[PDB]
């Protein structure tokens, strides 16, 4: 008997990628309540880095899957650095995401930040 | 009853830590398949 399987996970937090490529914004689904369980290493691993996880590759070119023994992963973080996307409604960047849009062109309170240039010239 | 030990995996994903001081790419080669079973804490978590 290992550390117990413990109970299985009832959930309010499910995540469903609408278009499996386009990342974030009101292209998404957080479905009706599904209860994760006590089963295996998988549901006890993809529990800890659920779909939409934030991880890096700091060393080897290897994909995430081929190491940690889970999932499928394509490298995120292209062309950016690590900045909070605030709950703040007031600030320009931290409220509505750059091109993420309601049909009014702005995002709602949202995420999927963008922006920036190393320089413009004055 | 504990959540199943379950399978191992096939792995291209581990490079060795080869050049120690140097960066993750600045030197190292993918450690070839080591299929790590379901045993105890380490390769359960450390995987």
Q: What SS3 string covers A39-77?
A: CCCCCCCCCCCCCCCCCCCCCCCCCCHHHHCCCCCCCCC
Of the candidates A56, A45, A67, A61, the residue with the CA atom closest to the CA atom of residue B11 = A67
Bridge partners, B30 (sequence order): B15
CA distance A96 to A106: 6
Residues in B whose CB is inside 8 Å of some CB of A read 1-6, 8-15, 17, 23-25, 28, 30, 36, 38, 44, 47
CA distance A116 to B4: 46
A94 Cβ contact partners less than 8 Å away, ≥ 6 residues apart: A84, A85, A86, A87, A88
> Which two tokens mark A4?
């117990």
Cross-chain Cβ contact A69/B36 below 8 Å: yes
Cross-chain Cβ contact B6/A42 below 8 Å: yes
Backbone φ and ψ for A16, nearest 5 degrees, come out as -135, 115
User: Resolution in angstroms for this experimental structure?
Assistant: 3.8
Cross-chain Cβ contact A66/B10 below 8 Å: yes
- Residues in A closer than 8 angstroms to B11, CB to CB, are 66-67, 69
* In contact, A45 and B10? CB cutoff 8 Å: no
* In contact, A69 and B36? CB cutoff 8 Å: yes
Of the candidates A16, A72, A41, the residue with the CA atom closest to the CA atom of residue B47 = A41
Cross-chain Cβ contact A60/B28 below 8 Å: yes
> What determination technique applies here?
cryo-EM
């Amino acid at each position: 008997l290992y550390v117990s399987q413990g109970p299985g996970v009832d959930i309010s937090g499910d995540v469903n990628l609408t278009d499996f490529d386009k990342i974030g914004w009101p292209n998404v689904e957080a479905v009706q309540s599904y209860q994760r369980a006590f089963n295996a290493v998988s549901n006890i691993f993809d529990t800890i880095y659920p779909i939409g996880t934030i991880y890096e590759n700091a060393v080897n070119p290897n994909n995430p899957v081929t190491y940690m023994g889970f999932g499928s992963w394509k490298l995120f973080g292209q062309g950016k650095v690590l900045v909070g996307w605030n709950e703040d409604i007031s600030d320009p960047n931290f409220a509505l995401n750059n091109n993420d849009l309601d049909s009014g062109g702005n995002p709602s309170h949202t995420a999927g930040g963008t922006g920036g240039s190393t320089s413009v010239t004055l």
